């Protein structure tokens, strides 16, 4: 059968791949660069924006924006460029044909899932979609049905107690220190 795409929009990296793979096929920084200097040489072939490893390689010439901070998507036109790059250039897959499992940090605004769904169905025309809490997946990843997952990204830190497969949503802590505030 058609596999699902599995795509995780960290603040810092995109990890994407196909369901049933043991490790992600595409990992690249979720960063969008735009040129900030006069274009002197005629016929070089200008580009309005670089994404991911393209923007890393050129980064002396570019302003680098992160379009997610603190697990919130803060401008959509960039995030849509990042997904376009994920499906068409890194996975080389028609998004028409595969379910996409997206991912999100708990307790963040509800307008972020609404937009993140609207863009999958209107723009990419995905057949079917899902959105899953990050800290729940680390238990599937670690063979457990019980645990308290501490998960810390580039943008957000959260604890999610899970006992015997029931989450305890009153006990969920979210903490807003992460790798980017360590870097600053």
């Amino acid at each position: 059968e058609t596999t699902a795409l599995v795509c995780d929009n960290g603040s810092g990296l995109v990890k994407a791949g196909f369901a049933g793979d043991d490790a992600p096929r595409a990992v690249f920084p979720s960063i969008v660069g735009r040129p900030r200097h006069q274009g002197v040489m005629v016929g070089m072939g200008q580009k309005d924006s670089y994404v991911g490893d393209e923007a890393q390689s050129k980064r002396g010439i570019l302003t680098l924006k992160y379009p997610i901070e603190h697990g919130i998507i803060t401008n959509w036109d960039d995030m849509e460029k990042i997904w376009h790059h994920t499906f068409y250039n890194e996975l080389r897959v028609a998004p028409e044909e595969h379910p996409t499992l997206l991912t999100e940090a708990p307790l963040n605004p509800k307008a972020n899932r609404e937009k993140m769904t609207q863009i999958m169905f209107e723009t990419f025309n995905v057949p079917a979609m899902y959105v899953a809490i990050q800290a729940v997946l680390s238990l599937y990843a670690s063979g457990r049905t019980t645990g308290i997952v501490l998960d810390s990204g580039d943008g957000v830190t959260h604890n999610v107690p899970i006992y015997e497969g029931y989450a305890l949503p009153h006990a969920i802590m979210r903490l807003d220190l992460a790798g980017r505030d360590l870097t600053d």
Binding site: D22, A23, L139, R144
Partner: protein, 746 residues
Amino acid sequence: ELYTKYARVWIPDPEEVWKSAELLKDYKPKVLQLRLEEGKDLEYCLDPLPPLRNPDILVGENDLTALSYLHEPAVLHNLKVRFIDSKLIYTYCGIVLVAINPYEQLPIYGEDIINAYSGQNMGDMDPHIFAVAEEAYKQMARDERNQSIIVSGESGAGKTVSAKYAMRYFATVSGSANVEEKVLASNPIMESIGNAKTTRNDNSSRFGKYIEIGFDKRYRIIGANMRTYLLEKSRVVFQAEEERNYHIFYQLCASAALPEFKTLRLGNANYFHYTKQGGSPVIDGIDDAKEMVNTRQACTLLGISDSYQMGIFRILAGILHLGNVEFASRDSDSCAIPPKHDPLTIFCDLMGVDYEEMAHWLCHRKLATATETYIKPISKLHAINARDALAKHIYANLFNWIVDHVNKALHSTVKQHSFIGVLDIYGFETFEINSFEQFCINYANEKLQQQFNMHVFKLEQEEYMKEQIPWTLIDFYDNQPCINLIEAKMGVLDLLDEECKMPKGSDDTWAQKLYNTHLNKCALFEKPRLSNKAFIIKHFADKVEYQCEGFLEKNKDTVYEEQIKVLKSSKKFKLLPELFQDSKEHKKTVGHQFRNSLHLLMETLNATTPHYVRCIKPNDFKFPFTFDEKRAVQQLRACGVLETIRISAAGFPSRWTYQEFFSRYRVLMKQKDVLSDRKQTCKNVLEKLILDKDKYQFGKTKIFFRAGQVAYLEKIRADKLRAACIRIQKTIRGWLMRKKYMRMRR
């Protein structure tokens, strides 16, 4: 309605599934008074009728569908009298040949009879396996379409010997200067690698062997090609009570003292964790040390060099020593092989690999994303599962390699124009305990009997088009809802492969998922009343209760690539790198590999035309040429014969050519009434005898009858014949009376 004084009926009995009974008082439209064996006393309570019995002239016929009354008593009786009294072991039901193990030898397979069957049509002769082989050889000429003879039955029913004779037929009638020697000399190899002692019997075959006999443009035999399917990989590492695994391991252990095998450092057959488990190393009456020699001689005859033979036994000793590798936990989430561990030392010596590399890779697994790579410890349970999956993978690849070198010897260079293919597959199985192996066997038999039921349904639509009879009359049993229960998504197999990869899955939580998903959603799935660790599937033959305990251990294969790359690095000997020379296949579970193998078998067979042989085993004790009712009925249900007979009984079972109808019922038809053609004569006479046509039909070539009408015609025929005998005898007897009377008057 016929029941009278001097009628006969069959009655049930726990000792023999039916007793014959004499009806002792006429029926009145509520309880029946019956005479029996052993004197007479019964009154038998009808419920809101007894099965009714064919006249004795019919019983013993060559074809169970030629009976007038069709039911399980009649069938069991015909087979019992033909087997015990007439010593005939072959019988027909519909298209199906039915074969019963005489279980002592017979003359019947002689070349004279082979020649007597050649060219004959299947109804021209008494049934014999050569009649099926001959019909196959005919159909392959009449159409280029290839032909399959599907031999099926319980273990010990005689499927292998039936294939043997079926091939001997082709090789006698077609064959010329050889296939026969090589194919028959392959059997000890395939039996050694592929047969095991099961609970109910020794020498059960755990795979479907398919021999293609290839023919040229003139139907001379070219050569043969052997395929195998459905190998029971799980037996390599797990064994139930008083099972064994594949014979080869025990022939090897029993040969451990021989000087070639000293280096292999083998022990007795219960020293190793993969042969100890069954608690039964010795078969009664088999000397494994000599079956070894007949195997090596069969290899030598097929031209597997002694170098490769020692390679094969080196790899099998490898698997045996691998099984003794013991893992110590060092943490809940990590394990290690203890220092200087002897089984691993001997294994790495045998295979010629670095001890510390195998020691590392058995206990760790590796992941790489596109950029960078990680090495994980694994729990002791996952280490043991990985080692067992590696042993299963070695064994399966060794099996495919031996089959490939046998094919090298059996193939011949001439281009094969068409083939006849013969399939030796285990039958529908039911045991006091049923486990994942039985669940696979019964799923394969569901598929095979779907094919069978469709073929029979097609054949009778085409006969009705030869005879201009409506199709609506005929129907067939549809077992697609059970295939969908087992095979479809959210089926029993799909939830098993899911529970293999869900975290902390277990047989108990698997069973819970089954109940949640099917328990009252599907009519064919049932939970046993007093347990939560079992489930019941309503197969075509019977309801079977499967036990959830230890499905998941049997279900699981994942072969860690790094262990294959260690074995592929081997430099000591030729064979071990050669096995793995040509992914997702490494992830696939045993259940999924079985599903795929079964789809390959069905792709092979649906491209063909089948002819069926069903083998049944008369008695469990190996007594020569005696018959047990209670087993035989179980066999005949498991073979789908009883359903085929019931279905035919619903339609128009009995089909008489008009001229045979005349040859039977001339007594019924008046010397005046007979016409200048007997077809119209009988078309009238039967309308005289039975007022309503609905009992019968008139075809182009045959009269069709519903069940029972032939027995009626024989009844009225015999009563009229006795009235004629009364006339003639009365006249002659009265003459003698007159003669002596007038002599006394004289």
